[PDB]
Design a protein around this ligand. Sequence first.
Ligand SMILES: OC[C@H]1O[C@@H](O[C@H]2[C@H](O)[C@@H](O)[C@@H](O)O[C@@H]2CO)[C@H](O)[C@@H](O)[C@H]1O
Length: 143
Amino acid sequence: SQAPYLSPAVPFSGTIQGGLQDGLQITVNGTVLSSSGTRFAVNFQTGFSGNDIAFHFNPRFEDGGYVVCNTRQNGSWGPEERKTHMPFQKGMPFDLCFLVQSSDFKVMVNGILFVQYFHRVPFHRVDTISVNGSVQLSYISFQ
Ligand SMILES: OC[C@H]1O[C@@H](O[C@H]2[C@H](O)[C@@H](O)[C@@H](O)O[C@@H]2CO)[C@H](O)[C@@H](O)[C@H]1O
């Protein structure tokens, strides 16, 4: 899109207008819930079902804190990329930004490069962003 989605309720699912295109920046601005309450996810997916998630970005406040990055294809999860030293904390606001590049998603958190996730499926087929889990959202916006 862009009008942004303002104060969207979680779980959230919404259209990305024109789908993912090279150069598109998707901001997810919100706060990790203080409750107990150990994971949240941002999914760049095709349609409503969640069977085809080009990029599942999944902070887990477990086993020291880590982020799982993965792709689901016709209902099947791939091999996980896991990143430690995660820049999310329970009760802490965040500005999470996804940049679509030709080769990857570049993910910035609070203005700092966090992870790159190389495309496993074509990114243009992504037409929907969904967010679920232990998070509240101030806005999701698009540049
Ligand atoms: O890979 C993303 C999905 O992970 C699923 O859980 C994994 C788990 O991370 C891994 O340790 C292994 O044991 O298998 C599971 C795959 O079913 C979550 O259930 C799912 O929500 C995604 O996060």
